[PDB]
Amino acid sequence: IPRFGVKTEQEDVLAKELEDVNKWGLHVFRIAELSGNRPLTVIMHTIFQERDLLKTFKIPVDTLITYLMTLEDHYHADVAYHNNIHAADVVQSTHVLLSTPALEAVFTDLEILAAIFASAIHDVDHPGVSNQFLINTNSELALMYNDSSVLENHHLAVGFKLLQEENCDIFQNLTKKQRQSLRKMVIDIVLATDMSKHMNLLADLKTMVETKKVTSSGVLLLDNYSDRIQVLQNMVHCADLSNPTKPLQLYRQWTDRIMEEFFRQGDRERERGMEISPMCDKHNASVEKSQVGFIDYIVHPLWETWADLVHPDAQDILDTLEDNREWYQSTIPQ
Amino acid sequence: TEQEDVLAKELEDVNKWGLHVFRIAELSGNRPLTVIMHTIFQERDLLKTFKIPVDTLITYLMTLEDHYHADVAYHNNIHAADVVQSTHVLLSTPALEAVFTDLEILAAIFASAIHDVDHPGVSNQFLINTNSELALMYNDSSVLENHHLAVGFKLLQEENCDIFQNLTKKQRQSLRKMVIDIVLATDMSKHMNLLADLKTMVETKKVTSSGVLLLDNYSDRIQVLQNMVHCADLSNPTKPLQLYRQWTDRIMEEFFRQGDRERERGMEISPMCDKHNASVEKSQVGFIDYIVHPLWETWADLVHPDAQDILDTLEDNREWYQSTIPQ
Amino acid sequence: IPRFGVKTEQEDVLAKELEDVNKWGLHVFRIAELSGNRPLTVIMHTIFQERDLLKTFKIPVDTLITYLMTLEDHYHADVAYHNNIHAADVVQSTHVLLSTPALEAVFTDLEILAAIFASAIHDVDHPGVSNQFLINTNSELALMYNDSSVLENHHLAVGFKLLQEENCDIFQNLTKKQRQSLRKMVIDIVLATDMSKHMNLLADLKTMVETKKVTSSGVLLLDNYSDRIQVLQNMVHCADLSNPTKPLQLYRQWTDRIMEEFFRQGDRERERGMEISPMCDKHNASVEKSQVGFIDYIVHPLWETWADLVHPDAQDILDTLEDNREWYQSTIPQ
Amino acid sequence: TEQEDVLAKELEDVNKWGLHVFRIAELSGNRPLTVIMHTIFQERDLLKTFKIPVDTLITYLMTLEDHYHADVAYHNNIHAADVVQSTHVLLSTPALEAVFTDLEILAAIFASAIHDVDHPGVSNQFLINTNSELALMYNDSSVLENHHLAVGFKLLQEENCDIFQNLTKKQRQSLRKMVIDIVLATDMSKHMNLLADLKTMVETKKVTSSGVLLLDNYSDRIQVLQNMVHCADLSNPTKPLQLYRQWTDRIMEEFFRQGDRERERGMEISPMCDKHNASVEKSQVGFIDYIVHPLWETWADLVHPDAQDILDTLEDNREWYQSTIPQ
Numbered sequence A, C: 001i002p003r004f005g006v007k008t009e010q011e012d013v014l015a016k017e018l019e020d021v022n023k024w025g026l027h028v029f030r031i032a033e034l035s036g037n038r039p040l041t042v043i044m045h046t047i048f049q050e051r052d053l054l055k056t057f058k059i060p061v062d063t064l065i066t067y068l069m070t071l072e073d074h075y076h077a078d079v080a081y082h083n084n085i086h087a088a089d090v091v092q093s094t095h096v097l098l099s100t101p102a103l104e105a106v107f108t109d110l111e112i113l114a115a116i117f118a119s120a121i122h123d124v125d126h127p128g129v130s131n132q133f134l135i136n137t138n139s140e141l142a143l144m145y146n147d148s149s150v151l152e153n154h155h156l157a158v159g160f161k162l163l164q165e166e167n168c169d170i171f172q173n174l175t176k177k178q179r180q181s182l183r184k185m186v187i188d189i190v191l192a193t194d195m196s197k198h199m200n201l202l203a204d205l206k207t208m209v210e211t212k213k214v215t216s217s218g219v220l221l222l223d224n225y226s227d228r229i230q231v232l233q234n235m236v237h238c239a240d241l242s243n244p245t246k247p248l249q250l251y252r253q254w255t256d257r258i259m260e261e262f263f264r265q266g267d268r269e270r271e272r273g274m275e276i277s278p279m280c281d282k283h284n285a286s287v288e289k290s291q292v293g294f295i296d297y298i299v300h301p302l303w304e305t306w307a308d309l310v311h312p313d314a315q316d317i318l319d320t321l322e323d324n325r326e327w328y329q330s331t332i333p334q
Numbered sequence B, D: 001t002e003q004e005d006v007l008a009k010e011l012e013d014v015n016k017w018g019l020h021v022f023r024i025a026e027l028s029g030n031r032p033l034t035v036i037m038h039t040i041f042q043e044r045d046l047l048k049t050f051k052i053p054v055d056t057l058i059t060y061l062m063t064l065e066d067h068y069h070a071d072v073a074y075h076n077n078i079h080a081a082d083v084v085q086s087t088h089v090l091l092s093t094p095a096l097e098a099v100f101t102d103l104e105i106l107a108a109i110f111a112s113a114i115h116d117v118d119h120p121g122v123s124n125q126f127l128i129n130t131n132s133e134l135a136l137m138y139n140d141s142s143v144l145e146n147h148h149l150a151v152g153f154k155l156l157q158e159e160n161c162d163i164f165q166n167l168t169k170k171q172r173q174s175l176r177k178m179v180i181d182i183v184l185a186t187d188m189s190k191h192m193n194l195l196a197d198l199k200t201m202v203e204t205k206k207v208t209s210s211g212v213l214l215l216d217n218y219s220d221r222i223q224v225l226q227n228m229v230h231c232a233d234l235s236n237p238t239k240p241l242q243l244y245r246q247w248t249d250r251i252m253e254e255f256f257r258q259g260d261r262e263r264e265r266g267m268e269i270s271p272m273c274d275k276h277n278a279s280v281e282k283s284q285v286g287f288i289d290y291i292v293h294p295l296w297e298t299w300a301d302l303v304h305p306d307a308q309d310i311l312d313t314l315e316d317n318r319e320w321y322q323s324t325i326p327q
Ligand SMILES: COc1ccc([C@H]2CNC(=O)C2)cc1OC1CCCC1
Pocket: A195, A241, A243, A251, A254, A255, A256, A258, A262, A279, A290, A291, A294
């Protein structure tokens, strides 16, 4: 029954931080500390209230919080990058992207709910290792998902499964039609987060930009499920790949975390007598170069395309990415 | 005794299109998949090539066959034996002579044998609509096909059932990836794509100085195997009318049963599952015209003219059913 | 199945057979036939209405029918004995046992609900082979349940799991308290149907009958949970082992079905080179002898003890058992 | 290597009851389970005896230890290492010399190693109340223990992890049964009877020629093994005070975190899990008085007098905590 979803006497400082919920560059780490490591629960609660999703979908308030806490409890606290903080961050970034001027009134509430819920569960119960590692070891997960998008299929199943715990079904008052539509979009979005799908996603996105249509209002025209879900997929995907576009201070912390996680896998791999995966070798690591390359061949190409689709709404995000790209470049030891 | 002699006579057509699979099922005490698989395995000296202890092969086959539903009219062990035998025939076609390795041959055959294991008699969509545990587990995507794979492989783990116990790590690794690629291709929701990309291949077709089809990379190799097994799965209409008619009676019984269940549950009845407003004859012609014939005609172009006789039996059965529609 | 609010031919016939639902010896096989192979759904529905369980527990009728059909759909039609007709039989039998005068007003509606629900799901998804066969073949079911009460654990897991399919949660309106109590009782009852528990289960029933206490009206007195659940467990165990107490005409059909199922397992075991389980070899079977043994060592000792518990309430039932015993005895070919 | 020596030195106590398991955890890069298990397996020549390839042993150990949650304060790889090492010491109790076969010894050490694998840091009742997937799968009965067994055995199926590959079908069947019997008995709800039967076995106690414990039937042999591992799992209070207080701090951190989770959810806060109404000291004394002491009193009363030093340490530790009880 508390103000932001959880109990905390630093509630005033947290309240002040959550004022930036609609802003790119939210101090998600401070919010994580101030909420007692409940960034996903408080940030989702704030966004649901802000968007009036509880009333619109008849979600009892206690059910929402029980589910959110349950969901957050299933992200691993010992995983440096793919944890609840990353989940909270993607949820909040997706929230900002959905509010872009070029997309106003374009998506329905159910579609908005789907993008946000998808963002919240997109990495749930991530072991801290890649699909390839899960595949090489013949893990039960790899076997159940026939080696195809193992982690991603797993994130979805868990997200939906938790809905079944006590007082966790936040979709209990949606009609069958709403639940099927929602479920489909969510699945379509989370499966798209698998990096092995990046190129085809980006390709289709560019195509859409090439044939970009806008209504009498200055907003994007999306006439069919295919184009709609495609935008939602690239949106969430952009949010999942938005670290380099945040204020350097936040970006650098994500870099330290993604590397700390990659090195754990690297170590675990050499212990098991496996070939150390790329960028997972703390002994042969070029953190800076790696980040620059990540931007040059992945992040910038994606955000440059998204920027065109919603031009000029994302111009500042793109400028920050470039400023950050140059910082790391200047950090590469020679 | 008399039983063995009759069954052995029938097993003699194992390499021919039109095997009396229904007779074999009867005579083998309902073990058509086990007897036909073992038959084919010896016929291809597969037990020797991959050093598969015989007792282990029979144990696994009976196990796999046991996980096919006896109460399911169409998607049962007979269908499985049929797709296995049919793929066995397509593998021996002239244009593919000496093309595939013993390992790839094993994969297409294994894939065929498990492609529908533990089939419940209802479609993916029915399992999705009812929120089945299976659908939730595979996120509504190729639900049954993913399950067929999982069961097929998991069954290798039962007592004295690992028929790949002697294959090397590299072999197992390669087999697993091909079977997954093959079975997942059986999902009809992926028919249009397979057929479209199969035609694209026939247009860039490349025959070697041996008159045999040339397949360089894995992508080309697998696509042919996926389509081969896909044609085998969709071969009922190209078989002798005697068999084809039985397959039709069986699939309709299964579809009608799904419709009765949907009617029970108040769900909307699926197309061709309403026993009160059905047109079996008409549906069969439509199935051949928009799906079966379009596909088998493409396969004919790839192995021209190896499948000419199959393609003619289809057009023939097509007419038989057409001249059956009342007025 | 009806037509214009007025019943159809078969339904009427089914309705007239269902009038003996409160009687020992219902023509359950005729009902299976008349109901289009839906004996479990029709009998469960008849009983829920008779005991007013839908109003008492606010179960929407459509939800109940949907779950019942779903539950019945998970019993294997290709299994001769452990199928939906058996489930229906144990349900109707438990139902008759609950109405014994010696137990009037003893149990609450929740306990009555648990006894009935447990009966309905007690053998769901039975594969037609024993626990030992699943253990010796290293089935995944055996692995999942660590070879302990494999099938009984599975029956339970499936029975509860089905409540989660579309519009199948018949307990959606019970409070958490009612659900946790119902669930514990159902679990305790079903796990007790494992024959390996028979001896200890019977020992405690006798012990209870030894210390039997009545309210000078015949009405048994069950204070604590330990005695209440024990009686319920034994009740459903009796229903499960009630075939030998039904009119011979019914009993013989059950005997033919169990033998068919046992012989099939033997066939599979002989195929697989496994040793043939007791009474599973069709080439060396003593059907009449086996039934005699089954009655003398298991069924008669159980029912005689139950006869004592509710005496004289089960005198007729015991009389039928002994008569069927003699009949089978005189049938043994010398 | 500078530390490799220190670690190797610390390992000179692998056979001593009081090993600084925490030190081994640090010096080994947090691989106390893999390290202790390897040392002990060689210590007993288990590798050669059962023909267990070193690779497969280390790979499974790392794979097993990796499924222990590093975020959990008490039920983690360190606790697992401690229980393996402890069971190891007890197995060497003179009153048991030559009593157990190598397969029975492997069974008790393996069980120990996986007895808490994949523990989420919350109790069975917490999983039951929340309607967790695990509880629904295991029907609220020994939920976690069933899970610990499942994961322990399943991890043998991963890449080069099956350490029991070279065992006959008879060995494997017996090992599996024994392990299951041991881990399932670690469920505290099984405590009262497990102790009851242990006492009875001590009354009718009987020794052989050498004067070593006489265990005829499986029932008795497994009962001794079940209780042995149970004592190892309930051995914290019997270790030197320094180690004991570390464990106490650890269980309490875990318990309070559950209480915090129960409180966030408006759930009833479980006994001793409320950091606002805690009696850490009084609870340790109650734990020793009503559970740990009666248990160890009987064990030492079965391996008389090998566990005398242990029992006395326990009693000393109890008094220390008792003096820390406010009021
Ligand atoms: C903070 O930077 C990164 C931020 C986010 C990611 C996600 C994309 N794929 C993943 O597995 C995680 C990778 C990053 O760095 C990668 C680029 C170079 C090395 C790792």
